[PDB]
Structure formats: structure tokens, C-alpha cells
């Protein structure tokens, strides 16, 4: 029993993190095979960061201007190129700790683990969700750019996120591993607006099912509802509208608990209008939306990885 915000084991990723320095600017890089990936703004000074022309900045940058450290090991850069918003540093040594990996682009609502690093050294691991406005609610300080988000499936590490910057509202934005930003953001120190953040409804429902699996049943009422009637109430509380495909994804959790999805929607609608009346659900006084239906099955059935 029990339910925790659980992250993937980070061992396979820790052995890929390196420190990248260009002049006085340092951040983290991802070392796979003989290539190091890092945010391209490593080539900026503090003055270039408001209106950087990265093509102009590359003119006075050579291979020997990049210093790459894998702990005590020094890596010699023998090539470099800019690909979208990341730099690809070709180094003289293939990473012997390279795992089986893929580059994946995630969609809003999906979750992943973040290995936060400073000076190429790990600091901590935590789990987060890609918000519907393409930000993440992370924990990052200056020097953390280049930290990566990942999932593990069977034996393969799936890299999905590389950290770049923090938005004024305290949320974070980054790219996939091809260098393309999540959301309508650019890597310069300008005022940039993100969309309105909404609550991921299918995830809240999966977390309510996790509650029932662990013995929390006080919020189950006698009501039912329809998709249209629920979505009418949901849109007022800034919830993403539920679709039929969301109902299908929740099928196995509904079958396991014996609670029809539309009955659970009725229980959620009451929690929205009436609150939780001093009770808690899985130790939380708020409705949690950073667990996917697959996350719940995984934690509640003991899925392990290589």
C-alpha cells in the first residue's frame, strides 16, 4: 500500500552528465556515444543574453573554446555544430557508459523524471508533468541548464527534455533532444508569455482510482453524470475537457476497481463544487494531476526496469 510521487532510478542517466564551459559560462551536457548535447546559450556572455544572434556568436568560437569535463576525465572537442537550440559537441572519446536510448518528444499531460545537475554533477531527482501550456513546474537554479528529463521503458532510456530557462512566473521551459522548444518560447532574456495552465483531468481521475486501490473511498457518492454535464462543470474550474479517448485509457483502472469512469466523474464534480471538507486523499488536500494512468498501474503493480 501507499502512494508516492515516484521517480525513475537515475543511474543510467548520471553516467552521461558532463560539465560544459565556454569562457566564463558553464552548464551541463549530455554525453552519448562520441557526442555532447548542451543548450546553445552556453556561448553567450551575460551581456549577449537579451538579444543574442547565435550565428554571429559562433563566428569567434572554435573547438578549443569548449572545455568538457566528465568528472576527472577531460574530453577533447574535435567538432561542433548548432542544431536548432542545442549545440552538438563532437568529442574524441565515446562514452563507455552509453545506455540504450531514444530521443522522444512528449506531449502535454505526460510525465517524466528530471535529474537536476550543477557543474555536470547530480543534485537530485524528481518527477514532473509537461503542463498543457508546455511548461514544467520544476526546481532549477542558475547553472542547471542542460539537465535532462527522461523515462525508462524496459531496458531503454527515453530522453524527452533538456532544461534551458526559467519564466518570470517561476515555471520552466526547455527543448526536446533535437533542440526544438516545447511551446512558443525562444532562448533569450525577453518577456515571454505562456498560455493559461489548465488541470489535466484524465490524470486527476487516474489518481482518484489510485486512491480507491489504496483504500480511500470516502469521496465515492451515489451520483453519476454524463460527459457533457461533467465537462460543463469542469470548464468553469479550469479543467481540460474529457473526451471519449480519455475514458478508454481509464478502462483497466475502472475494471480493476469496479467503479465506472462516469461514476468517478460524478465524484470528482462533487469534490470540485464542495471541496474535501477537511478530509485528505492519499495525503493530499488538493487534486493531483501529475500521475498518468500508466504511472498509477506502474506504481500499484510493482513494474521494475533493467
Amino acid at each position: 500500500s501507499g502512494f508516492r510521487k515516484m521517480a525513475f532510478p537515475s543511474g543510467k542517466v548520471e553516467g552521461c552528465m558532463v560539465q560544459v564551459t565556454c569562457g566564463t559560462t558553464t552548464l551541463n551536457g549530455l554525453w552519448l556515444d562520441d557526442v555532447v548535447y548542451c543548450p546553445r546559450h552556453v556561448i553567450c556572455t551575460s551581456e549577449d543574453m537579451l538579444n543574442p544572434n547565435y550565428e554571429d556568436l559562433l563566428i569567434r568560437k572554435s573547438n578549443h573554446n569548449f572545455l568538457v569535463q566528465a568528472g576527472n576525465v577531460q574530453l577533447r572537442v574535435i567538432g561542433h555544430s548548432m542544431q536548432n537550440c542545442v549545440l552538438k559537441l563532437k568529442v574524441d572519446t565515446a562514452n563507455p557508459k552509453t545506455p540504450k536510448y531514444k530521443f522522444v518528444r512528449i506531449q502535454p499531460g505526460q510525465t517524466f523524471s528530471v535529474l537536476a545537475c550543477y557543474n555536470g554533477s547530480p543534485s537530485g531527482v524528481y518527477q514532473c508533468a509537461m503542463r498543457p501550456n508546455f511548461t514544467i513546474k520544476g526546481s532549477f537554479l542558475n547553472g542547471s541548464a542542460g539537465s535532462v528529463g527522461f523515462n525508462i521503458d524496459y531496458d531503454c532510456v527515453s530522453f524527452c527534455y533538456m532544461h534551458h530557462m526559467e519564466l518570470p512566473t517561476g515555471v520552466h521551459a526547455g527543448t526536446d533532444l533535437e533542440g526544438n522548444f516545447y511551446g512558443p518560447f525562444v532562448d533569450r532574456q525577453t518577456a515571454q508569455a505562456a498560455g493559461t495552465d489548465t488541470t489535466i483531468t484524465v490524470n486527476v481521475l487516474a489518481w482518484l482510482y489510485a486512491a480507491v486501490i489504496n483504500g480511500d473511498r470516502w469521496f465515492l457518492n451515489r451520483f453519476t453524470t454524463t460527459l457533457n454535464d461533467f465537462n460543463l462543470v469542469a470548464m468553469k474550474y479550469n479543467y481540460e475537457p474529457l473526451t471519449q479517448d480519455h475514458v478508454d485509457i481509464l478502462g483497466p483502472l475502472s475494471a480493476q476497481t469496479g467503479i465506472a469512469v462516469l461514476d468517478m466523474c460524478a465524484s470528482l464534480k462533487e469534490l470540485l463544487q464542495n471541496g474535501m471538507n477537511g478530509r485528505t486523499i492519499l495525503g493530499s488536500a488538493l487534486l493531483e494531476d501529475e500521475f498518468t494512468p500508466f504511472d498509477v498501474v506502474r506504481q500499484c503493480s510493482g513494474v521494475t526496469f533493467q
Binding site: T24, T25, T26, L27, P39, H41, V42, C44, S46, M49, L50, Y118, N119, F140, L141, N142, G143, S144, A145, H163, H164, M165, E166, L167, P168, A173, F185, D187, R188, Q189, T190, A191, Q192
Partner: peptide, 8 residues
Amino acid sequence: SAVLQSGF
């Protein structure tokens, strides 16, 4: 503004 989170 947005802040690029490199270190110095």
C-alpha cells in the same frame, strides 16, 4: 524576463 539558467 525569461532567465537563461547557465552558471558563471
